[model samples]
Target: SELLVNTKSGKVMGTRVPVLSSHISAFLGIPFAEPPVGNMRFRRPEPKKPWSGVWNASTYPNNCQQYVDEQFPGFSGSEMWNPNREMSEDCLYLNIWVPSPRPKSTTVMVWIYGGGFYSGSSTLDVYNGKYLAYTEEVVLVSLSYRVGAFGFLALHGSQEAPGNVGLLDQRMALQWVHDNIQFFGGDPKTVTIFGESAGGASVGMHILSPGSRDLFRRAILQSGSPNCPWASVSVAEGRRRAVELGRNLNCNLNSDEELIHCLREKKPQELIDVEWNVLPFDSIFRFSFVPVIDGEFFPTSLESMLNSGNFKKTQILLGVNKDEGSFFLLYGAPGFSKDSESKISREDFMSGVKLSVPHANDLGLDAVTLQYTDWMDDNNGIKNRDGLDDIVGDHNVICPLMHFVNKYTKFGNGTYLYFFNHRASNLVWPEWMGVIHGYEIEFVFGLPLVKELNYTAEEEALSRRIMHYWATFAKTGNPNEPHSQESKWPLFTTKEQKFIDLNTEPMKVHQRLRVQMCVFWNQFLPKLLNAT
Candidate 1:
């Protein structure tokens, strides 16, 4: 049967699909905002104009302007995550998957994807929502937003290009969900916003933003937070980078207005083709352009927002994988550490640490090296693969997340945390990479439910258990319902700090995960900003 729903704009027609004992209505490529092209480029998105006629809502949407996978030195996902289709500036669309038969105004789960803020689309196969929605009896939604310079170029104080349009694009999508989800059998009041990596940082940004605070009630941040250093830059630095980009594109102008006008006249690919690495050897965690802390949207620092408890009362689930940095090993890979067995020499490791943490002095470097060095092995990094992953992951992803988790607990009882300790059986990277970043995504999205790949017996069971927990959380603020079969997931409190571990092991629960490492990065390493 044809599945059609009335949105704020017009009637959108979706397709029905077999889902377990019932069916689902899948809607794809529904526009939430006007295309950020031509005159609207780099500015806050305008809501999509109402369209007449039955809008065909099938197939994936064009990704926002970005350097496609072939353009990058990225080897992550073994190319599985490469943009499967074309992208453009006219790419502000969203997709929805709903249980075909629903009258209870089921819980809504809106999704945001991760790609370091420069590259991401909701159309990836791994993020498919059919199984998750059908099995959990929930509504799953994903949307596209601007990326790279097109989404996040700030020209001093120019309103035309105020930057953070990428983030603004996200807020617009969230608003669309709040206003229109009920038409698709979803409860606006029971909405949960979730994302991974940069998307997780986006969720954090929404949680902190005053305008976006009321749109959703819960969040799931898979290995991301607004606290991450690379997630955003200040307006001053953004202004400097924007002008530098304009210069690179031969649009060097004396005034911010001139710069915005000249940049607007350039082609999309021209804006996306800038150098990304901050330094020659520093290819890890260096995003050329990202959301800026525009005084209007992100008026205060995330630290201030978190510490002062000025954000929303939203419940949240946040966690990082065990080998999060191993995914970044390829930046210097096949040249520095060719394969799984290869090891980075001591000099290369030391240089990497210094480059990533420039403020750390000789003593600071020594402290970091001593802290990260694997005590069981020779101290000079002959076998420092683990140490390298530790340093990179801790500095970029873990400590910042731990910091957010710690401060967030002060808000209330809705906070929960987890550690991804399992790797996919059919992983493309070496087994030793050990549950690197994004490894947990397939399970969270319930890829095993559809047999997108031949999942193991254990994995299939694990995926179902996780789906129950997430759906339960989205429905009510708690992951484990009183009648749940899985082990109870404790709220992440300031004192106990208990968190579940997602792995093949018997669903372990741990406390103060990576305690000593977090201490150095969160407690001590930050002193360099003032002391140095």
Candidate 2:
């Protein structure tokens, strides 16, 4: 039953994940950190003990209990909204997939799943690291972290327990990978931390967090905005969110100590259930359980750090889907508000630009909206196209991503920006959410094509190529390396502003296509560029 595997650390024995024999090394349910249960509920993840026996790494561990089960169905079992079903507190385990014992120069990809800071796991079918491990020829690792109240709630009296235990848990997971991945053919020195949505937001925090730096060399952020909204909120705001939670559970919020204790005493699943309903309101959910710019973990905000050339040395490959809002509109309950809808206007879009960049003007806004409208006109009525045509498309996601790109490129780090253009069959109403949020995850990780999702052989090949680029980027500092049977990847530069357009006809690079739109966003977007 033992298979010899030569890893970066040394030769070790590993088992396979059931049906996958072509894969040499497979590990699952490995404890990355000590159990965060009992009194350790909201505390930081402690170091896990090194097992003396040959540990089993096949079956996945229980997923972390979290809110937003609707968005993450695989973990929900049969009942969608029931958090009580098949949930656990001792869920901080991780899984790994390595190709063979003798890996020929591997890259480590540490994954963070996205579910609005509440729910997701390393065990999701879409996140199977097996193929990603074999095809990319890299060590793929995924881990579970605290979610919902257990992970993010800010305590009133416990200054000893700083909030954001979730983020701290992530920090610990990375540290664990640094220490142990070499044992499984992974390069601890060459780690790329990547994620999407809330997970992508976590990467944004990693960029800002002192605890996270030097832990990762490169970062890939998909569908995340690196602003204050994504970073920090006032303690009062945290309290407000706590009060809201108390109200949802019909508990007294006035006695802050009692409130904290009551919530703590409540079953973890109950707490997760409360969060499930409370997350829909952006006003509340945005402030609750999010990363804090505590000046210690994150000495400065992401924008301030970026503007000050903080991330000058870290190579980053980051991007957002073509139409992120469509997913939010369809899957996220209650959809968009008037303010969110208002982002579609030329003036409103300009206002967003002015908000981000002080020097923005009406002319800039006009040009930007016009360009977006024109792109829509040209690309519309196609088989796949939707919210992508709106300025909200940029305001909600793309613009913020571009801000990070501009900052990094300005600091002279190699940065690549991509627009996921291929559309899936199940995108959403209007029937063309065209690369809706998270639609590109399977593709980037090179998951098998599902006919239901409109994936074709060509698309599958493109996914392979994309994964290769990512793995190469993680291995070397540059993503521009020429691998066999793949196009020569290009490095993003300020002069060219080159970006890869990930679409059906293989890979193509373009520059200045959305110039007017980006220029307007640069001008009118919030002054607190990293304010989210």
Candidate 3:
């Protein structure tokens, strides 16, 4: 059935899809910004012009231009996980799934997809919001933004090609939701921004952005934070990459103006097809094109802003998987693999530590290895190899995340932390790589409803619990109420440091997750700061 709704830009027509018993009205591929093509390419997103008649939003629009590798080695099952949507440069579109028989004001969840900062789309099968909208009784939304060089190219000090354009695209979508969600029966005041990986870091950036103030009421960050080493690049590095990109395309003009003009005249695919020349250390992290401090959107470093209490104060929920670093090792590390024969030797482990922590010398590497491996005398050989995973997890994802959470909660913000320990039944990897990064997204989105994945009864129940917790948080900034199935999730404090252990049978409450590991990393952080 076609349903017509009046939006600020114009009238849009959506389609109704039946759920288990109820139905959800899906408004897909509505333009939130002007098509960033022609002269608009590599510039800040402009507000979408109003249309004359009712716009057809039933079909999914072309996703932002991204190179998809179906046969990427090591990660054999990655193609099955991501969306196969059509790709183009004119892709600043957003999707919304509104429940039928809508209440006057329902909670809203705005999802941002993560692919480092290079690849992702709102139309991914796992990201479909229909089931979540039907089961949770809340409005769900997702938006697409430019990635790679198109979104983050920086000619440092130049006004024409400022970086962080992708983030600006997201901010425009949030503003659109705030101004127009009421027409879809959503409460503009009760909006929660949530995402995984780069998406999570994007949410963190919004919380720190002065422009993003009053745009969202709460945030949920899964497996990413602004403090992560790969989130932001320096102005010098940004300029260097811009010059390299220009040189690669034979647009190496003397001034930034001429260079940008020459590059802009080239086709979008030409820019997308160019490979970034990455440093040896950064190759392990795979963060070539990322956000940079452009003096406007990001006036200062994210850590400096957070430390000075200059960010917006709002309810927050953030966490990481048990073995977050295993995913990186599976793909980035040369010797490591899913095959049992491929093991990380002590030498390889030390080399990885040195590469990850460039400032840390041999002494510092030894200290880190000893703390993670318990003097390297453990009898289990497999545990020794897996210990490298733990080391990388703490250094890259877990420790930085805990540091951010601790600082954010110390200022008396309403904060909830979780440890995702549940491994989905559909995982293709060996059990040794426990609860790898982004594994929790499938459960959080209730993937079983969309695909015929074999899910246990307990797993299904856990999904319901997760959906309920997330929806309740979006509704009232508190994941727990008197009627909630789980125990009262306590607020995280600097003293107590509480977090929920999201598992199958019953959710458990724990304090100081990865406490000892964080203590070691926290002490080492000062050295990193000085070195950087």
Candidate 4:
């Protein structure tokens, strides 16, 4: 049975969604940019071809090619194989889910999935968007952007692929939303761009980007921060990484045309495998695969831009999990174990600190090291019942960066910060793991989207709360509307600087924990300022 519905383009049939009780009027696999394949490979995304007929947008498009384990480990079963979709370069598509029969007031959310800037799809199971929209009365949207070398690699001496094509794809998607979301019952003016990890980092780029400055009214960055080691590297460094990639692929990278042609001609699966296995795990930070600091788009160094009060008008919410580094430490790369404790001494850890923060003076180094050691050793602080040191390791990377958000928000512009400590048993491989990275995503999308089948009733309720907070924020600049049920989230000030800690039973906020430690880190900034 076909039911009539109104859209920006025209009237369309409303179809019943497979999972939700309500009907969804959606347009899937809609092209926002020209296919990033063939001659278009590695180039900036071009305008998409407009279709002639009333395009049936019920089905999703293929996911972009990404690393597979052995080729790419740590991928859940659903990612290893999704029967509903295929993989290809023509993967620049976006999915939409708007409540059927359309509501008068609607909020728009554009989701960017995290995969270390390499392998992930907007259609991942946890990205269902339907439950979020259904529960919060908003229009939820997810987009597929370029990834891996195709999206991020910067070729030497070639303006052909200056890198950041992935970001360009995101910009195009936002433009599409701005122009067409009203047709899907979404308010373009109320759009919020959100993501976790690389996605979150991408949000940081968007927040700092001139191209995206006016595209979104608000932003949410989960378990990711803008201050990273690569946040300072020059474009020359990116080109150097591309040279390394060319070497690994055994191509004559000196010739730009030849290199681009060679990469495009290579089999997609083979490329995924080589990119996954050829590089050392540590290469993730060193490689040319993250969103680049392209001058035209990013404008200035993110820190400089933020410090200059560039995003004064943009309402921003950014945070990381208590254990953002645990999953990566355990399964993503070189595993860290109890036995390796002897290998990484206090001095070794301090050395890493100096490496990441080059501006730190001797005193600053000592101060920062002491703070980091406490965070690593203070099992009592956050309780590592999950038994992983990576949690603390990632905190060291993300926490300091989060403070920057608090600093910016203090001056005004409504910045909300959080520390997600809620753990869902269903999302973890072992039932014992606590609030690991990427875990909050399942909850944000709702329990039904989780196939692991381990969610306790309490966890599901928390999931609902998370969904409400995110959706409500998308609708309005504030995450604290009374109807959202999230307790009054206070603004994070430089003096009081409180972060909302997501925990069980009566969610609460606390003064930034381990103040002395963070103070010590702040002192050490001079020594560690230029490792990027």
lDDT of 1 by residue, 1-532 (tens): 3488888899998888676657788999999998878889888999999999988997788877777766245665656676766877889999999886754588999999999888887888788888899888899999878888888887647789888888889899999999999999889999888899999999999988898888898898989989897898888888888888888888758898889999889888777776363222345676877878776777688788889998887688889888877766655433244354546676667766675565566878888888877666654443576677778788888888999888888885578898888777877676656787887889998887656587888888888888887889888898887975757888888889999887767867789988888898988877754586
Score candidate 2 by TM-score against the native.
0.80
Greater TM-score among 3 and 4 belongs to 3
* lDDT of candidates 1 onward, in order: 0.81, 0.65, 0.82, 0.66
Specify the poorest-scoring 10-residue window by lDDT in model 1.
275-284
TM-score, cand. 1 vs. native: 0.95
- Number of clashing residue pairs in every model? 0, 23, 0, 19
Best by TM-score: 1
In candidate 3, what are the lDDT values of residues 1-532, reduced to their tens digit? Answer: 2378898999999998877667879999999999998877789999999999989999898888775655455464577445567788899999999988755689999999888888888887778788888998898999888888888888777877888899999999999999999999999999999999899989988988889877989999999887787778888888888888888899857999988998889887787777446332544555667889766777788778878887879899889999887767766665676666446666777666666666566677777767766564654446666777887788778888898898888663699999999888878887777898888887888876544577877888888788888888888888887675546888888888889888885667889989888888876655645565
Clashes of 2: 23
C-alpha lDDT (0 to 100) for residue 25 of candidate 4: 60
Two-way TM-score contest, 1 vs 4, winner = 1
* lDDT of residue 73 for candidate 3: 50
TM-score of each: 0.95, 0.80, 0.94, 0.84
What digit string (tens of lDDT, one per residue) describes model 4 on residues 75-188? Answer: 463343232367788898888877766765588889988767776787766677777877777888898898888888776346678788888888899888898887777788
